[PDB]
Ligand binder design. Structure first.
Ligand SMILES: *C(=O)N(NC(=O)OC)c1ccccc1
Ligand SMILES: *C(=O)N(NC(=O)OC)c1ccccc1
Ligand SMILES: [Mg+2]
Ligand SMILES: [Mg+2]
Ligand SMILES: [Mg+2]
Ligand SMILES: [Mg+2]
Lengths: 277, 277
C-alpha cells in the first residue's frame, strides 16, 4: 500500500498523503518514512507529503547487491545514489521544483540533492545535520567516527572470536592459523564479511540443529568419526567421544589439528586412503 | 576455473580434481573448497575429489535472497539447504552413492546429508563436529554460543553508541528514543541489523562526504537550517551555527529535539507552515 518508483538497482517505496505542492521528507539513520507520518497529517492540507524509505531500508528493495566498494569509509556511492533517488522521485511527481526536508543523515542526502540536482529544489531545510567535512575541526569529528566504528566492528569481533576459541579449547596451531590475516586487502575484507556471516547465520543454527543419536545408529555402518592428533582436549573431540560412547561408531585418529587437512595433507590423505581407498 | 551446478536459489561452485569414485569435501566456517586443494592433490589418483564452496560463500552465488527468518538463531533453513545442495551435487556427478567428508560446521552439513538423503551416501566421515544438540550438557554449550554471538553483535554496538551519544552531546530524550528496544525479539534483530548497517555503510561515508560551504552559498536563498529547541548543546546544532556564521543562511528554531518531527508533530508543522505555507 506504499507507493513504488522503480529505479536503477532498487524499488524505492514511499508514503504519499495530501494535496498541493510536493514536500519530500528524507529520513535519517532509521531509514524509513513512517517516522514522518504524524507530521504529514498536520501538513496534508497544504502539501502533497512524500515520506521515503531510502533504498537500503524498510520496504524499499535492492534489485542488485551493493558494490563491494560501498564498505570503504570514503565511498560516495550510497550518498550519491540516495540523492539521485530523491531527484528522480521529485521529477516523477512534479513538473515544478519541490520542497525538501532531511534530518540527520537524511539532511546530508538533502545537501547532495541540492548540489547535484538543484533544478528539482524549490526550497530545502537541513534539520540537525551531522556532516563534518567543511568544519574547521573536521579531523576531530572524522577521527571520532572512524574510531567508534572501528571499535564496534573490529575490536568487538576480534575479542569475541578469541573467547570462542578459548571456550572450545582450540589448540595453538589452529588458533594461530584461523586468525592469520589474509595477505591482500581484498582477502582481509572478505574474511571479515565471512566471519560476521558465520556468526549471525551459521554457528547457532548449525550447532543446535536437529541431529539425534538415533540418526547415527540407523546408518552406523557408513560412518567414521575423525579426531586430529594435534587437537586433543578440544570440544569437538569430546563430541566424537560422546557419539562413540553411545553408538559404538569407531573414532579414527588423523594427523593435524582442527585444520589437519591443510596442515598435514600427506598424512591426512594416508589415513583417508587406509579407510576408503 | 571452477565447475557450476545451478540449483534452486543458488549457483553452486566447486573444485573438481582427479579420477575415480566421487569424494565430496564440505568446508567449515571458511565456507570455501580451496582449503582442501592440497589434500585433493594427494588423493587425485584414487578419487574424483569435489571441494565445494557452500552457497553463501566464495564463488557460489545466491540467485534469490535468504529468507528473513534465517537470522533467527532457531532457523534450520540454511543447514537443510546446504545438505540438499550436497545431495544434488552427488546425483549430478555419480550414479553410485559417494564418499563424503565434512569438517567443523561442514561435518554438521554432512550429518544432515546422511539423515535426509542417505541414498547418496556410500561412506561418510565427520571430522571434529561442534554440534551440541544431543549432548548431556547441551544447555551449557548452546547458551555459550548464544552468549558469545550476542556479545559480539548487539552488546558491543550498545557500548559504542553510548560513547557516540556522549561525544556528540545528544540530548537524553533523543538518546532514549534512539536506543529503545523494540517490543519483539525479531524487531530487535531488525533494529540491530539497521544500526550495524548504518555503522558500516553510512556514518563515515555520509558525514565526511564532499559538501563545501560554497555549495550552500550558491543557493542560499533556498535554504533553511533547523535546530530543535530540546536538543541544545548537541553537535548538529554546532554545525548549523557554523554554516550560519559563514554564510548568513538563517536558522529557524523548531519544537522537539533531534527527533522533533515525531516528538512534537503539531509544533513542528506549525513552524514549517510559517516558513513555507
Ligand atoms: C541521525 O538521525 N543520526 N545521526 C546523528 O545524529 O549524527 C551522526 C542518528 C540517529 C539514530 C541513531 C544514530 C544516529
Ligand atoms: C569450524 O571450522 N569451526 N567451528 C568449530 O570448531 O566449532 C563451532 C570454526 C572455524 C573458525 C573459526 C570458528 C569456528
Ligand atoms: Mg568543535
Ligand atoms: Mg595405506
Ligand atoms: Mg544467555
Ligand atoms: Mg541484549
Amino acid at each position: 500500500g506504499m507507493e513504488t518508483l522503480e529505479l536503477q538497482g532498487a524499488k524505492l517505496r514511499y508514503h504519499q498523503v495530501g494535496q498541493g505542492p510536493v514536500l519530500i521528507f528524507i529520513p535519517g539513520a532509521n531509514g524509513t518514512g513512517d517516522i514522518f507520518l504524524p507530521l504529514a497529517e498536520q501538513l496534508k492540507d497544504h502539501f502533497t507529503v512524500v515520506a521515503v524509505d531510502r533504498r537500503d531500508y524498510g520496504e524499499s528493495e535492492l534489485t542488485e547487491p551493493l558494490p563491494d566498494s560501498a564498505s570503504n569509509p570514503d565511498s560516495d556511492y550510497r550518498v550519491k545514489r540516495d540523492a539521485q533517488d530523491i531527484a528522480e522521485l521529485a521529477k516523477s511527481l512534479s513538473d515544478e521544483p519541490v520542497y525538501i526536508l532531511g534530518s540527520s543523515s537524511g539532511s546530508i542526502v538533502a545537501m547532495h540533492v541540492l548540489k547535484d540536482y538543484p533544478e528539482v529544489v524549490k526550497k530545502i531545510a537541513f534539520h540537525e545535520p551531522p556532516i563534518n567535512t567543511f568544519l574547521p575541526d573536521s579531523t576531530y569529528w572524522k577521527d571520532k567516527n572512524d574510531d567508534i566504528v572501528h571499535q564496534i566492528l573490529t575490536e568487538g569481533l576480534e575479542k569475541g572470536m578469541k573467547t570462542f576459541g578459548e571456550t572450545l579449547n582450540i589448540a595453538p596451531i589452529d588458533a594461530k592459523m584461523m586468525s592469520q590475516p589474509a595477505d591482500t586487502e581484498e582477502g582481509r575484507i572478505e574474511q571479515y564479511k565471512r566471519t560476521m556471516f558465520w556468526l549471525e547465520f551459521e554457528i547457532r543454527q548449525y550447532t543446535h540443529s536437529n541431529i539425534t543419536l538415533d540418526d547415527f545408529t540407523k546408518y552406523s555402518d557408513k560412518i567414521t568419526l575423525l579426531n586430529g592428533t594435534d587437537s586433543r582436549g578440544s570440544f569437538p573431540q569430546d563430541v566424537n567421544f560422546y557419539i562413540n560412547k553411545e553408538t559404538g561408531i569407531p573414532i579414527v585418529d588423523i594427523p593435524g589439528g582442527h585444520l589437519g587437512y591443510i596442515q598435514k595433507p600427506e598424512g591426512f590423505a594416508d589415513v583417508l586412503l587406509n579407510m576408503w581407498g
